Design an enzyme around this catalytic site. Structure first.
Site, short mmCIF file in Angstrom:
data_model
loop_
_atom_site.label_atom_id
_atom_site.label_comp_id
_atom_site.label_asym_id
_atom_site.label_seq_id
_atom_site.Cartn_x
_atom_site.Cartn_y
_atom_site.Cartn_z
NE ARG A 94 -3.15 0.51 -0.94
CZ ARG A 94 -3.44 0.52 -2.23
NH1 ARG A 94 -3.22 1.58 -3.01
NH2 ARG A 94 -4.00 -0.56 -2.70
CE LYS A 129 -3.00 28.62 -4.95
NZ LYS A 129 -3.82 29.40 -5.93
CE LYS A 161 3.06 33.38 -3.69
NZ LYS A 161 2.49 32.64 -4.85
CD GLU A 190 0.77 36.08 -6.62
OE1 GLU A 190 0.03 36.77 -5.81
OE2 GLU A 190 0.79 34.81 -6.71
CG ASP A 211 -4.16 35.83 -9.10
OD1 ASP A 211 -4.49 34.65 -9.40
OD2 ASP A 211 -4.51 36.38 -8.03
#
Lengths: 273, 274, 274, 272
Positions: A94, A129, A161, A190, A211
């Protein structure tokens, strides 16, 4: 890229101190032939993890690699085969499968986006992310799928940002403070509107990230930037519009959903007799 | 109880390494900001204790109030946490905190979806071990916050005989006889993927039977054959559009791989005033 | 990032509490509330308080506490480091874990402080080594720093230190340094020497730092003279407290001591309940 | 007893992700003869850790075991020797040495106390005042030095402590609750005075631990108990009084200082 720590942590969470009480209460010396088999089409990713794990148990697992990371393969394709002491194989099944299903899921969705911008200059990039604890595996998988990465983390690249702008009051002051403190660093910023693009251009930044803008706004940014800065489009861009974004003339498209909110690939461990 | 301190440390270490946040540290000095962690859609809230723990590392520089706790069902544009911080301490932990709560809420929310859809039946929704590597316990916790349950945390804390056990030793009856010799008084669950295996598991008086990738027809048959003598669980990635028909059969549990992998992260952001 | 003790905390909890938990405490206690204090039984340099904080903070609903001394505080016999109120059922199972940590950490900080005080008014800094307690490298080096000491490197990744066994493996000091310089451009180079000839050859190669391993005071004095401030000089070995000042007055820069992170006395600190 | 996790955590803290930058920058295919040699008299302990580490790198290290755990040996004694690729041996030198020096430390001091109570019926026991993360290595090392252990941790045996009594109000109540809740567990209780010893006896406990009593109180407790319970002494136990304590007629002496506040043994890795 090292996977040893994530492998250990995955083993520890599943095997703890008592180990696999089911396997250990049933099996002794049984040996089995096995195969790691895809149950759908996929871009292979994660084989080096499987190798590192099998290589811990070298006396007890013999194996053959049929597919390497980056190979595109169909349903019912054997990725790895071999023979093992079942008491050593079943406890790690697993953990190995969860890694390659996750990694192949990222490589495969990434490749779908890369194929869809084919014949434009654009490269697909990952973001931060990513799944917690798997930043490097996730970005590696995006690269195996044909994408790139701007930086690994907050340490190896500058990206100013929205929340830096809101905190210090202006794009101009933020870049000013940063230039003073950092040694001729490559600056990315950004922007979520055209006035920020213009201000970023006044300050001679190296890269501008657009963005959640409309296509018409992206085209205006391409026009005003005029090749004086790299341009990147960010957001979760779906497969149905990434090509139209690509055709605007930007250099990069960064996509959140290639590293979170994606489908794992169905891969299993099949054992003979 | 469940601790997140290690998964938090590893998330922080992977994003902040040795140099720290070079962007934030090179730009910010003493600015204070008002912030809100705001949802952008409907969701089941999950992961708040993680936010609390990370925020508690900077008690001097982050002041906050929790407005929603784990398990709260909330709407779009809802404030889960608000407060005031020294920006230089908040911005470097934003992405880590958000990745956690987006992941946790994604799981809790998909679970709740499945839970609601089998409402009016006895069925409980269970997690599996097809969890995100390194987040077994966060993922299982999140399924529980969403109204689900768990048979076992890992390979140490419960018996579950699989296809691959049966295949390695050659028979269901041998596996169970060996297990009982080694673990007396132990609860026994076994995976079956056909009716013959359900019949053989029953002869051995197992406590729990999992039906793996069986058709709705086979499941109804298994339920009739089992006759309440054992717990019955259906296992696989079930569409939300099919889960209820499975629940109507009479089985006790449905465990679903895809509520802990292959789910949509929820959209949640950090808004700064401003 | 600030140092993290979360991993070593979890391993200490796991080894003492396992899967069944504290069977004694859980079988006797219900809702009993107790006032408690963590009290020294002798003079010590306080160390390990953040660990105590992290453990208490895992049980915040059931443990209310106030810190009265911080790490690096020097305090007397019968001093209260921390006091508070707790549900007994939650305090008693973590008692021994917390005490073992602070008694260990405080033992290191206190022996270090002793060596630091005794070299006062010389330029010498006391340094830790890698002869730490297995699994506690970072806690041990942290506690040496709490005690007024320093550290060249945390482990084998973050500094160069060419050792007796490197020199023996490649054949010579000159060849070792040459190879390292070929591979790591502008790396700070430290090398351990156990006689004057090796000091002379290291100096010829312009090393940044020379370690004197088990040399006599006479050889140390000869080395200081030959080096003439052209390299950093460190004396390494388990110096006695009654002979460390003598070593310090020779004019070396550092003294590294193995026996401040192994073979030291834990401090006596207890948990007193009313 | 598994040492796999403790090995992993020691390797991890010392080698991290970058590995050994000194060794990797100087050496390639050099092969070396080596010996793990004692610099002092000791009881050997930790050899199974060395074996498990070397057995990770079987292609790169060949070795011979000359001394096993529990062997009493002199200064300048080769415990293990062999041949290895230097690039694989040098990075694990410090981890291997710290484990055997710690473990030999505990076994050696334990054995000193065991030798000192020789010809009495007493067994030396470990406590839970062990090095954090090394509970099992520390208790194993005590056993190798000739000692014993009542329990590994808070899960595998009952010990009613001072703080249980302070928290619930009486010995009688604490025992009464425990007997309802636990299925016929062996009951051990810590007493710091003779009234507590008397109360534990009227509750038919299995074991009584005398916490920091005077020799005369310990003798009185031996008298009162009259063989109706196991007697153990904990407290200010040093090598100069442990035999006096042993001669009282108690069964066990537990000693904190054999697993913390002990001298590591000086052992080294010598190369040719």
């Amino acid at each position: 890229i090292s996977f040893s720590e994530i492998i250990h942590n995955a083993l520890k969470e599943d095997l703890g101190d008592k180990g696999d009480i089911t396997t250990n209460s049933i099996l002794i010396n049984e040996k089995v032939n096995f195969a790691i088999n895809t149950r759908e089409n996929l871009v292979v990713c994660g084989i080096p993890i499987l190798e590192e794990v099998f290589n811990m148990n070298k006396e007890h697992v013999k194996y053959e690699i049929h597919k390497k990371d980056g190979d595109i393969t169909g349903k019912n394709s054997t990725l790895v085969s071999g023979e093992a002491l079942a008491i050593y194989l079943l406890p790690i099944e697993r953990v190995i499968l969860n890694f390659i299903q996750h990694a192949s899921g990222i490589a495969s969705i990434t490749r779908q986006f890369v194929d869809e911008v084919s014949g434009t200059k654009v490269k697909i990039r990952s973001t931060r992310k990513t799944t917690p604890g798997l930043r490097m595996l996730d970005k590696y998988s995006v690269c195996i799928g044909g994408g790139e990465s701007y930086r690994d983390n907050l340490c190896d690249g500058v990206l100013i940002k929205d929340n830096h702008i809101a905190s210090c009051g202006s794009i101009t002051l933020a870049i000013q403070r940063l230039r003073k403190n950092l040694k001729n660093e490559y600056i990315a910023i950004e922007c979520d509107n055209i006035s920020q693009v213009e201000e970023s251009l006044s300050n001679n930044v190296d890269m501008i990230l657009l963005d959640n803008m409309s296509i018409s706004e992206i085209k205006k940014a391409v026009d005003i930037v005029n090749g004086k800065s790299v341009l990147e489009v960010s957001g979760c861009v779906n497969i149905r519009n990434v090509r139209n974004i690509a055709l605007t003339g930007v250099d990069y498209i960064s996509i959140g959903c290639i590293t979170n909110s994606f489908q794992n690939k169905d891969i299993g461990l099949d054992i003979e007799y």
